[PDB]
Each structure stands twice: as structure tokens, then as C-alpha cells.
Amino acid sequence: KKFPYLKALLERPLVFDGAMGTELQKRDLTPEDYGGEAYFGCPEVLNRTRPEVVREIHLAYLEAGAEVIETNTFGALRHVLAEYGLEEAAEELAFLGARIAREAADPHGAFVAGALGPGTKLVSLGQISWDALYRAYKEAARGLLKGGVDLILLETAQDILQVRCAVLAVREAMAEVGREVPLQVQVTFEATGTMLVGTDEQAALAALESLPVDVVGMNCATGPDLMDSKVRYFAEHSTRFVSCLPNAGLPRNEGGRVVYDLTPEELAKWHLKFVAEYGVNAVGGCCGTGPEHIRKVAEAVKGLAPKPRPESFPPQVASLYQAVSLKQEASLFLVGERLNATGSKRFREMLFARDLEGILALAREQVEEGAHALDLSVAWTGRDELEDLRWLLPHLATALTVPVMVDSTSPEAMELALKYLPGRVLLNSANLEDGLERFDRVASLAKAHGAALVVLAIDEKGMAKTREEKVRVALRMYERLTEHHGLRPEDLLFDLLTFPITQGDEESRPLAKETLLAMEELRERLPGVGFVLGVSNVSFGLKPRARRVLNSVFLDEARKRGLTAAIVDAGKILPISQIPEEAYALALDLIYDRRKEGFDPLLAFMAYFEAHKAFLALPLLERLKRRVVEGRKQGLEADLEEALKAGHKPLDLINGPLLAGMKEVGDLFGAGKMQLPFVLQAAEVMKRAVAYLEPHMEKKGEGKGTLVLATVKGDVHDIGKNLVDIILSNNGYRVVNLGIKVPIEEILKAVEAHKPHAVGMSGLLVKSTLVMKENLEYMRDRGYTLPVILGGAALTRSYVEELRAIYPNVYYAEDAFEGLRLMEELTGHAPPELTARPVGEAPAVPRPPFFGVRVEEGLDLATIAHYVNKLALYRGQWGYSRKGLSREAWQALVEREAEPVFQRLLKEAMAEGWLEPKVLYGFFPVAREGEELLVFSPETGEVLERFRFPRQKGGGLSLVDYFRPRFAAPLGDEADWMPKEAFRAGARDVLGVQLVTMGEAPSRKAQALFASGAYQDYLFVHGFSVEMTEALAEYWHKRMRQMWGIAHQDATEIQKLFQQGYQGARYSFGYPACPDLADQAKLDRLMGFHRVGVRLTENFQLEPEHATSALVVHHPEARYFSV
Ligand SMILES: [K+]
């Protein structure tokens, strides 16, 4: 409003500049240019040594259409510059940078943002002190302000505590030089999805909303693909203006020059979405981006009308990691009390002994028991408060999931706490016991750091005990906090005091009620504010069970009167339902002071508990059943030996509780109350129970019946088969698993030896359905009429009845549990219930970055993880079924249960290194000749290979139709950049090729988990591995499109990519458009699959398991089709 920059943000989208760093690399500067060898590479020193070079880059961006340029001052901080011996030059280099930008900006009417980066040292991990970090930002911001920047920009924030430190430092520099400007703060979200130190986007925005920041936003780390979700969050929720400056995606080496593939036109489309859909206010580029990126962005967003920002932000608190709302719906905001020195005894002794692992474990307990935040008080009689805090707080900063309520009478101790604790904190003591000047101290501290304040109702003349007092004190404090200090009502939590009403004393017994009555009046009079109570103090001086109940009831009553938070022992808080009826009634009589003549509620409440008052306390029979159903590994072997000592025979133990459990699991799975991963968890408990009882039995029985299970010849790792093995074995039966790639010779060899009820055949691949026919054709000659059970994703239910002519007894199995039902009926444990348009010419031939084939190693797995089809993973692979559930209810199920597994598996795979993404990829000059695609050499021009792609029957569609014919007249420049010899030979098109692999490691790891009987982790690890390999193919296809110059036609939503929402298509050998696997040997010769550790078999199958190749087609009308 006041400042021109914020006026401009209201009127139009402001286009920021792109990268300074990458633009300097083009100029090929020398140590002389940086003013010495020591200073070489420091861009900020160029403000001194070569201003004209910095000026020129600003001009290039201004001309392109940036209305805002950033000063070349990112690392103009003491501790950053120290690496170059320039620690003393921060204010100078900041100033000169700001003066260079000012000179470039003034003719163009453009804004200048005083950019300061996050530095090289993280405050939250104690790599730099608050005071040191504070000084560096204050120094460099005075320089920026003196050079005439129109805003201060805190860029690339990794540490949310640095954001608070830098905001305060910068605001004080403004005070010193007597000039305010708007403050823009931009965080950086890693591809993992949080800031580097751990802060998610909810925590980051909660922190920023409490501080005096005019524009919040995002830059660097990722391209716009991964930013989308984060920038959507900021745009939708932030009351401030929103900025967004993505990278040009992941970098790529190209002859020792670092190259980025995100084009101007793609960036433009992303920023158009961010401005037009989400209402982002400023947009620019970060690493990789140049003037051309800015040019296209400006063109895209010019003219668009800004959306107005939300008026309000929900009141919420934040730790280093996560946000928590102060208003908890229905419930309360529970603050754990047990990290108090005076209160808790266990904490007190742990603090004195310096038992960190004890204190953190205690803090975990409170969180598990349902604390939303934790109270912290270390103020003991004698001890140095500051010194105990200095020891403890660095560990709490990074250890704690939940935020902290700093409970201290000392403002010095509070200020110290605020310098260690990241996020948005609460402060406990804001009261007028020692006059205004110590109340105002804590308030200004809460306002400056953006903390939520607990406003305790204690004035100069003693405490507030009655209703009238509690009200009058609270209104005086509310007036002070709002009008003087400027704190919002939502920031305040008023503690109307909570006095003890027990101990047998009168005067104490009507005070719990005057709190409740005052709470009502202030709820109505002061809307917006919160209400906290030290709830455990009402029952101070009472037996353990008695205090538990009275506390629970006073909590509930306070809630009804308007309580929004409470300091409690969350573990002990009872729902009033579970309090017995007499106790509840007496607790209320006590609270509200309902003395009849022959009745004291304190006596009767006390008297009640005198002479009154896990699944381990169950029957031994039923406990072993629920061990299976609930999937409880711990205490199985302990309970089994207890059963054996009571003379329970192993067979009737297995057939009794344990098979009863797996039956209940089969029923719950049918009813959709239990999903597949948890069913496998039950099967583990069963397999552990069998394995314990195997040495303690003489039976060695055949079970319900035998089954010879196997996977067909020329197939691959069939998890589906192994799930049959798991489910059947642990439902009583005896499977013999023959493995994969078994021919019909050795499968029937098992049949004569074992002599089974049924013979299971299975196959993942589509081509092994015809190999199953050949198996059944082989069997009828020898005269076999055993009931064969066919299954797999390859087969269909109609096809087994059509195959029933060849073999009489053949049955389908959709999943493992149909295969179970089948085996029940055969063995006799159940009744027999089962007894094309033509292709127009391409508008261009897109120019690739190179011809030939390259290798790309070490692609960021978090970037790849973005392109996972989570629907395919969670529903398909992991078996979180959709049927009998809504589409928003299923999204809740997976975000609860599946998504944490994924996050864990991603973190594991990155740390432990068991996904190794490699990519073999390239472009070849090609041409159609008839019904063939000729692949010409980039060097010689000779025809290296020829592909006869199948055409659809009845003169239909073919892959060759997407390619230009030999000797065609060029559509444009092709002669200038096609390989000279190939072009003379008649090549007139380009074909992309790609082979991606995650390596052999995830296959080994999956097999080892199945071999160890960790069935659930086998399911998870296998599924994750498949879809991460598909994600790498999806990701790389996007990279191929980007470097080809066609990715501006991609969808800006990821699920649209999975529905081919992009130009062209990729095609793998096996797909119905090209089902001949033999062509993969042609692609091996062109590319050289050994270069990324991929091998092609005799049967033209790729090894290892997690590997896929594809032809990549640029043609806009290219779509998936079938012959
Ligand atoms: K920039």
C-alpha cells in the first residue's frame, strides 16, 4: 500500500530476474577479474573488482522483462566471505551490489531486491551462534539499505530459526539507518519435501506468518514440477504476497559445462499456472535460468489481474518440523507438563544429572500420550536457569516433534530460549505481578519473535481469585497487548488462574468455579483469544486416583466454558465416559461447591476412592488367536512356551487359535476392514508360530492338503505366486514352491514325487499365457487330469473357460484368496461352489541436444520419487483396495497407512543405497522407408538397424507412421544440425531411445525379505522398487522431452503425465504396438546396454528385474495403440 513495491504487487505480477551465478560462468572470468587468486569464484567481490560485468547481467534481465532485479549479494555475509578472506567486506560488497543494481534499475523503472542468502552455517544445529548470525545480516542489510534497495530479500532459507534471526537483524538495520522497506522471505524446499533442517511447508508458513514479513515464497532446490505442491500451499493460505523462483530442474554434464533442460517456454507455462490458478504475486528463475527464461515468463504473465490474498491465517504453532493448530476441533490443545522442574520430580533429577536420553524419552512419552506441545521450566531454587537452558535447548531444538511452551519468570531466560528454539514458540509468564515494565518486556519479546503469549491474570495488587477480578485483570492486559504492543487476539492465551480446591480447607473449594464463570464472560467479550489452565493444580493435595478423576472433569467443564488449551499430563487424562458415575457426579459437586447440610463433596469425593477401584490380561486360548489377527510379533514365543507347559499339543494349538486367527483375517480382508499388508503381517505371526512348534512335534503332518505351485517357463519374478505360497501355507496347506522359469518337464516331476491335490501355474508376463496353453496341451497327452489352478495379471476369467476345451479341470484365480477358496473346495473343507485416424505430417522435427548415446548416473531419487504413480503403487502393488470405500476416504487411508511406508522406503533407499538409478539414453537420425524404420549412424551415415514395426490389421496404424520418409524435403533447419553423413544418406527424422535401471540391489533385497519371512516388507520393497523404476522411466521421458524442446506441451499435473498428457509417446518392446521382444537386441546394438549394467537374455528379456527400455517418439499425434 505505502511502499511502491507492494503497490505494484497488488496491481500486476512482478517478474523477477534469473540466476546471477550461471550468467557469470559464460563470461569466463579470471583471478585478476576477482582481484586476486584468493577471491576467485566469490561473485560478491565483483561488485568491487568488475562492476560493469554485474551491471551487464542486470541489464540483460531488465531488457528481457524483469521488473525486479536481485543484488549480487547472496553470500555477502561475514562467515560466508571468510572462506575467501573477505570477512570484513560484507557491508561494502552489499552496498556496491545494491548501487550497481540501482544504476541498472533506475532507467527501466525497475525494483531492486537486496538479496541475502542463508549462509554456510545452520543455527539450529549449532554451527553458528544466534548473535554471530544476527550481526552478519544486520551488517550486510545496512549496506543494502544504503545502496537504495526497494526491498530486502532473504533467499534460499534452509533453517527456519535463521529466518527468524535474519528477519530481526534486517529489521534492526532498518532502524539503525532510519529507512524501512518491505521484507520478502523465501525458503527452499528440498526434493525430499521439507527444508534442509526438517521444516515442512505448514511449519514454515506458520513461522513466517507470525513475523513481520510482507512477501513469503520459495526458490531453488527443485524445478517447478516439485514446487507446485508447496507454492500451492503458500498461495492458498498465506495472508502475505507469495513469490516463486524455481530451478531449471536437475543439472546435466555436457563436456564439462553444466547444462539444464527446463526451457523458457516450460517455465513460462508453470508460472502462468502459478499466477492464473494459484494467484502467486511474484515469479522468477533460480539456478539454470537465464534472460530467455525471464523473457517468456514475462510474456506469459503480463496483463493478468492479481487475486486478493486471504484476510486471515488460522492460529497455529510450529516446531522445527511441523505445525499444530492452537484451536483443536472438538478437543483441546494439550500442553504436556512433565518437563517442569518444580512440578515433575523425574525431570528434575534427570536435568541435574544431565541425562539427555532420559529427558528426550520423557518428551517422547508425553507426545505419544497425546501432547500437542510441551511446557518447559528449569527454574530451580539456587541453580542458574540460563545455564540449564544452554545445555538442554540445543538438543530439544532438533529432537522435538512438537513445539515448546517456554515456562519461566525471567525474561532473560525467555529471550535465550527464543534464540535456540526453531519455529513458533509459546511464552508462559506474561503477567503484571512486577508492574508494567516487566509485563511489556515479555510482550514485546513475544511480538518481536512472533511467539504466542500466555497472558496470566495476576496484577500488581496480588492475584485474581474471584470472577470480577479475573475479568478486570484480563481486559486491562488485553488492552495493553493489543493497543500498545500490536499483538493479535489470536496470539494470546489468557490463563485465568487455577487454584487447588482440595486438602480439606475452606476458601479453597469455590475457586475452581470462579475460573469457569470468568472464562464464559471473557469468551463472549474477547472473541479470537485462547484460554489455557494449569489443570493439575485443582487437585493439589489428593490421592493419585482422585486427582486423575477430578482433573479430567475440571478439564471437560472448562472446555464447555470456552477452554482451548490446557497444561496436563496427557497420559492420565480420562474421557468422562470411563469415569464411574458416582465419581463423576461427586467431582462436579466438588468443583461447583454444592454443600448441602449433611453433605461435604470433598469428604464424599475423597471417601469414594477409599474402598473402591493392555490385552495381556485375556484368556490364553483367545490371546494366541488375537496375536495372529492383530499381527503382534512380540510375546508370541513367550506365550507359546506357556501353552506347551500347560500340555497343549502342537497340532490342536495350530488348528485351534492360530488357524482361527487367519480365518478371521481372511474374512476381514473380504470385508475390507483389513488390507493386504496387514494380512501378510498376520501370516508372519502364523509362520513364526509354526517355526517354533516344528522342533516340538512328532506329527510332521501334511496339513489340509498339498499344492505344487510354480511360475511358467520364460517368465520373471512373480510376486503373485509368492503371495499364494504365503497365504495358502499359513492357512494350513503345504505349498511346494518350484520357483520361476520352470518348464513342463520338471513341474510334473514334482507332481509324481509329492502327489498333490492341485497344480498351480502362474505368470506375470502377457506372453506366458500362450506358454500355459502349451503346458496344458502337454499334460493331456500323458493323461493327467489333476485340477490345475491358473493365475496372474496376464490371464482373464473368460480365457480359462475358453481354455477348458484342452484340459477339463482348469480354474482361474484372481488373487491368492480365491486360490485359497479353490483349495478348500478340492480338499473337501468347503462345499463345491466352484465345480484409428491416419497420421498427419509432424509440424517440425525437433532438434536434440546431441546424436549418439550417453550415460546419466546419480539422479536424485527424491526427484524421481515425485514421478511415482502412487495410485498404481498403493492400490495396485501394495493392495490397499478401493472397493467398498470413497475416493476421498481411500486418499485418507493411504495418507495414514501407505504414505509413511513410502517416505521411509525413500529415506532408506537413499541412505542405504539400494536403488542405484542409471540411464542410457540418446537420439538417432532415422527415416521411414516403406514399412521400415532405418536407424542411421551419427558418424558414418550407414544404416545400423532396420525395424519392421507391425501394422494393425485392415490397413491401420503403425509406429513407422510417426516418422518422416527417406529423402523428404526438410520442414526447416534440419540440414544444419542433422549428422552430415546420415542426412546425405536420406535421414530426415530423429528417434529418441532410453534404457533406465535401478540395478540388481532391490531384487536381492526383496528376495531376502521373502526368504526371511518378512512378507509385509517384501510386498512393500518389491512394489516400491517397481514403481520407482517406472518413475525413473517417466521422469527420464520428461527429461528427453525437455532437451528435445517439446516439454512445454507437458501437463503441469503429474497424474496427467501418467495419462500421456504430453507431446508424443514412448513405446517398450512387449507393448501391443510393438510386441516382438526380439527388436530389443537391435536396441542393444545401437545403445550398448552393458554401459549401465543391463543384460539381454537369449529370450530377449532385460536383466536385472528393475530395468526397462523404450523408443521415444516426438510426433504430436503419437498415442498408445494395439494390434
Ligand atoms: K533470481
Numbering used by the authors: 37 to 649, 658 to 879, 897 to 1184
Sentences from the paper on this structure:
Cobalamin-dependent methionine synthase (MS) is a key enzyme in methionine and folate one-carbon metabolism. MS is a large multi-domain protein capable of binding and activating three substrates: homocysteine, folate, and S-adenosylmethionine for methylation. Achieving three chemically distinct methylations necessitates significant domain rearrangements to facilitate substrate access to the cobalamin cofactor at the right time. Here, we use a thermophilic MS homolog (tMS) as a functional MS model.
To that end, we crystallized full-length 132 kDa tMS in its apo-form and solved the structure to 2.78 Å resolution. tMS adopts a compact, wreath-like form, and each domain aligns well with previously determined structures of equivalent excised domain or tridomain constructs. The original apo-full-length structure reveals the global orientation of each domain, resembling the reactivation conformation (Act-On) and displaying the flexibility associated with the linker regions that connect each module. The active site of the helmet-shaped Act domain is positioned above the Cob domain, where the cofactor would sit, similar to the position of these domains as previously determined with the structure of the C-terminal MS fragment, that includes the Cap, Cob, and Act domains, trapped in the reactivation conformation. Notably, tMS crystallized in the apo-form; despite the absence of Cbl, the Cob domain retains the same Rossmann-fold demonstrated by the superposition of apo-tMS Cob domain with the Cbl-bound Cob domain of E. coli MS structures that have so far been determined. The four helical bundle Cap domain is displaced ~25 Å from the resting Cap-on state and virtually identical in form and position to previously captured Cap-off structures. As such, cofactor entry is not occluded and its binding site is solvent accessible, with the Cob domain found to be preformed and ready to bind Cbl requiring minimal rearrangements. The tandem TIM-barrel Hcy and Fol domains are poised adjacently, separate from the Cob:Act domains and align well with previous structures of either the excised Fol domain or with the N-terminal fragment consisting of the Hcy and Fol domains. The edge of the Hcy domain rests against the distal side of the Act domain, forming extensive interdomain contacts through >25 hydrogen bonds and salt bridges resulting in a buried surface area of ~900 Å. Two out of four linker regions, Lys649-Asp657 (Linker II, Fol:Cap) and Glu877-Ala897 (Linker IV, Cob:Act) could not be modeled due to a lack of sufficient electron density, though the other linker regions, Pro342-Asn352 (Linker I, Hcy:Fol) and Met741-Gly747 (Linker III, Cap:Cob), could be modeled. As the only structure obtained for any B12-dependent methionine synthase in its apo-form, this structure gives a unique insight into the potential domain movements required prior to and once cobalamin is loaded.
